[PDB]
Design a protein around this ligand. Structure first.
Ligand SMILES: CCCCCCCCCCCCCCCC
Ligand SMILES: CCCCCCCCCCCCCCCC
Ligand SMILES: CCCCCCCCCCCCCCCC
Ligand SMILES: CCCCCCCCCCCCCCCC
Ligand SMILES: CCCCCCCCCCCCCCCC
Ligand SMILES: *[C@@H]1O[C@H](CO)[C@@H](O)[C@H](O)[C@H]1NC(C)=O
Lengths: 221, 103, 58, 97
């Protein structure tokens, strides 16, 4: 009985399966991610199209696991396919049941990565590209160590010294006086000083949104 | 230990880091003394790496000695602090491929 | 050419993937009370591609 | 305004759906305020809003004469609004009419 399913692979349906992967790739550019739960008509039919893609992919997984066995299938590039099927099943089930349920929808963007695998004419060029990656690992560790050293030095020197900016001296409203907050340091500390009518006092005017300063170690890195 | 410190630090945390700083500089001074006993200064200065270690440990102790006074209170020169981190470069020497490439 | 098209096809596929991922992460989340100068946004796929391309060139 | 037009019975269908969150919501609120600024005391007004359900941003549920006072309530309600949900013009317009 398993042969009847297996001989189907002799019939080239892999062409239709790759056209299905391409169809799903197309069915993700149309999906507009509206800001906060909004959704036009198209986004309300792409769930149905996604259900169809789920069914076809899981049928293919069943066929190619039954015809090729449970143990042997993972021992191949198909590792991702079953992974995608598992996460997509879980996503659909949880979404229907109802939290990180929605955000988990991103795991489908790997399906285009199935396209390159399906056309073995490209796996060669992928292998070529990653083959040249190994020599860089020495440069990778060198740059990693340079980053660590310079981040630690920055922590030692610029130890959160960019949190004081120039404030209005009238004092009615305490907002960063300069439209472009430029960290200033009050006298007794080398640096710039406010203009003739403002005062540089502590606070967190700081750099843009406080994302680029040297406060933590992660910020330094 | 070096990377741990961060802005808005706790006075207890600063004290603990000072303790660990003294401990680590002590261990590296033990490194130095054991190497010297292993072989004399003329052989100690044979490779620059140990000479490179020479200035780091002295600078670190200079840092610790300078730390005895309290210009700030747990309620100036800041150059020798970087030798501690620069000592990390020794770790880059263990790898041989990177060593030969950079050299 | 037949060898060029493979590499460019691979890179095009990579940009599509890292744009379709940005859509599911930052899709329409670039709405801030500040003035909307966020031209390089992730809203719609034709513009997610331009943002990813901008990041690639850096 | 007293001369350029006859009295009115406005009904502002502010579109608080997810598609307006951000700057556009601020523009909507400011525009609604600057519009209610252009209503006399003899022409009525109300402020509905639809996100698959046509609620009312205020406590009124019908037209309220746009006095100097009711305008205050409508402006405060508009200012204290937030986007959500799914846009549905049919329900909003049915409620409005
Ligand atoms: C490979 C060629 C076909 C690619 C497109 C397949 C999916 C198209 C279905 C969704 C299109 C929007 C219809 C929603 C109803 C207005
Ligand atoms: C490999 C070592 C990991 C570090 C584990 C200890 C974390 C302690 C850091 C957080 C302390 C916050 C103090 C300031 C408030
Ligand atoms: C109130 C004193 C705080 C602790 C300072 C003592 C130095 C050692 C740190 C505490 C023990 C944690 C493990 C240290 C590494 C072996
Ligand atoms: C505030 C006292 C004067 C400035 C002290 C720092 C002087 C040295 C800065 C550069 C040191 C790092 C060199 C690059 C890493 C090898
Ligand atoms: C005597 C053998 C030397 C082997 C090579 C060591 C290279 C050390 C310097 C690498 C370049 C500077 C990186 C860090 C700069 C702060
Ligand atoms: C805004 O309206 C909501 C309605 O749920 C209410 O709970 C809240 O107290 C209001 N806040 C302000 C700022 O008026």
């Amino acid at each position: 009985r398993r042969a009847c399913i297996s001989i189907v692979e002799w019939k080239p349906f892999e062409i239709i399966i790759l056209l299905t992967i391409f169809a799903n790739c197309v069915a993700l550019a149309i999906y507009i991610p509206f800001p906060e739960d909004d959704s036009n008509a198209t986004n309300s039919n792409l769930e149905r199209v996604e259900y169809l893609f789920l069914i076809i992919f899981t049928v293919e997984a069943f066929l190619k696991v039954i015809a090729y066995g449970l143990l042997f299938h993972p021992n191949a590039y198909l590792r991702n396919g079953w992974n995608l099927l598992d996460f997509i099943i879980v996503v659909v089930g949880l979404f229907s049941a109802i939290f990180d349920v929605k955000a988990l929808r991103a795991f489908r963007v790997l399906r285009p990565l199935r396209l390159v695998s399906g056309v073995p004419s490209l796996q060669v060029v992928l292998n070529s590209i990653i083959k040249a990656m190994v020599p860089l690992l020495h440069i990778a560790l060198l740059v990693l160590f340079v980053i660590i050293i310079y981040a630690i030095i920055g922590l030692e020197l610029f130890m959160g010294k960019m949190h004081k900016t120039c404030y209005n001296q009238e004092g009615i409203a305490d907002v960063p006086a300069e439209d472009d907050p430029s960290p200033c340091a009050l006298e007794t500390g080398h640096g710039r000083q406010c203009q003739n009518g403002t005062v540089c006092k502590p606070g967190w005017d700081g750099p843009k949104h406080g994302i680029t300063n040297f406060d933590n170690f992660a910020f330094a890195m | 230990c070096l990377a741990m410190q961060h802005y808005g630090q706790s006075c207890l945390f600063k004290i603990a880091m000072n303790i660990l700083n003294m401990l680590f500089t002590g261990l590296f001074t033990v490194e130095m003394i054991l190497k010297l006993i292993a072989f004399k200064p003329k052989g100690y200065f044979s490779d620059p790496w140990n000479v490179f270690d020479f200035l780091i440990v002295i600078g670190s102790i200079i840092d610790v000695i300078l730390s005895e006074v309290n210009p700030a209170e747990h309620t100036s020169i800041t150059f020798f602090r970087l030798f501690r981190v620069m000592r990390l470069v020794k770790l880059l020497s263990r790898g041989e491929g990177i060593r030969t490439l950079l050299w | 050419v037949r060898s060029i098209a493979s590499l460019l096809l691979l890179l095009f596929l990579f940009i599509i993937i890292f744009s379709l991922l940005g859509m599911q992460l930052f899709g329409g989340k670039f709405n801030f009370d500040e003035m909307q100068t966020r031209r390089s946004t992730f809203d719609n796929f034709p513009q997610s591609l331009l943002t990813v391309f901008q990041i690639l060139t850096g | 305004i007293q001369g350029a037009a006859s009295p009115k019975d406005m009904l502002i269908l502010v579109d608080v759906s997810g598609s307006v969150s951000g700057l556009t919501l601020k523009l909507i609120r400011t525009s609604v305020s600057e519009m209610l600024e252009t209503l006399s005391d003899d022409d009525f007004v109300n402020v509905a809003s639809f996100n698959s359900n046509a609620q009312d941003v205020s406590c009124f549920q019908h037209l309220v004469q746009a006095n100097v006072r009711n305008k205050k309530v409508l402006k405060d309600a508009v200012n204290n609004i937030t986007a959500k949900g799914i846009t549905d013009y049919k329900k909003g317009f049915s409620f409005a009419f």
